[PDB]
Structures are given as structure tokens and as C-alpha cells.
Amino acid sequence: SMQEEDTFRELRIFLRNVTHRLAIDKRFRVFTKPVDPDEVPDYRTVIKEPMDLSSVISKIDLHKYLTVKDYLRDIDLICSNALEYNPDRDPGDRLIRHRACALRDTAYAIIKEELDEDFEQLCEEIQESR
């Protein structure tokens, strides 16, 4: 229905706003673009499904997300990829892991504050019906 298409348009507006607020935070610069294959040739042999905030924006516009649960799987993948690729005790790896955990925690906190649980439930029931 037209009303269901309006629901998914409001979801996209909400997800673009959350993603922009993450992408402008200085702590999260390393997560804003894909890893450069020239500077890190081993990245795509270790990490099987790369993800970053520019690709998340592209996916919103391609209508890949029908629920906030769908979106948070990709935020969780940005964080888990960083923890997997950078697991050592040295300061550069510990700084990237701290920032990845802060990206995940910040996204979940904005959603807890600003997503209506009945809006999410409506998106999930339309998705289930298709």
C-alpha cells in the first residue's frame, strides 16, 4: 500500500540522520570509507564481508533495510570486523577496538532514545507479510 511505502520512507529518513551523526564524529573517521586495498592488501583475505558508513548510506538509498534490526546487523558488522582484524595488545589495535565499541554503543543509545518501539514493530510486521 501507499501507507506502507510512507512507513519505509520515514524509516530511511531516520536511518540517514543516525548514520550522518556517526559519520561526522572525529572518533569514527576510520569507519567512514572502505579500507584501501593498496595500503592494506591482506584486509580482504581476512575480512570476508567488509562494511563502512559510506556503504551503509548507499544501502539505505537502495532500499536494502526494511527494519532498524536489519540496519543494526550492518553496524554490528563494522564493529566485529574491527575487533577481528585488530586483536593485539599494542596501542594502535587497542585504540581502534575502543573506537569500534564506541560506534556500536553510540548507535544503540541513539536508537534506544529516538526510535519508537511501535514504529519498529510496524516495519517488522510489513516485512513479515511480503
Ligand X SMILES: COC(=O)c1ccc(NC(=O)C(F)(F)F)cc1
User: How many other CB atoms are found less than 10 A from the CB of residue 92?
Assistant: 9
Q: Which stretch binds ligand X (CB under 6 A): 5-13, 20-28, 58-66, 82-90?
A: 82-90
Using CB under 6 A as the binding rule, whether residue 55 contacts ligand X is answered as no
Burial 25-64 (b: 16+ CB within 10 A, else e): eeebebbeeebeeeeeeeeeeebeeebbbeebbebbeeee
Q: Which stretch binds ligand X (CB under 6 A): 11-19, 32-40, 54-62, 109-117?
A: 32-40
Nearest-angstrom CA–CA distance, 1 and 63: 16
The Cα angle at residue 121 between residues 25 and 55, in degrees rounded to 5: 35
Using CB under 6 A as the binding rule, whether residue 101 contacts ligand X is answered as no
Nearer to ligand X, 7 or 86 (CB): 86
Using CB under 6 A as the binding rule, whether residue 85 contacts ligand X is answered as yes
Nearer to ligand X, 23 or 35 (CB): 35
The Cα angle at residue 78 between residues 48 and 29, in degrees rounded to 5: 125
Least distance to ligand X, CB of residue 61, Å: 22
Using CB under 6 A as the binding rule, whether residue 39 contacts ligand X is answered as yes
Which is nearest to 114 in space by CA: 51, 75, 77, 68?
68
Nearer to ligand X, 89 or 112 (CB): 89
Site residues (vs ligand X, CB under 6 A): 30-31, 35, 39-40, 82, 85-86, 96
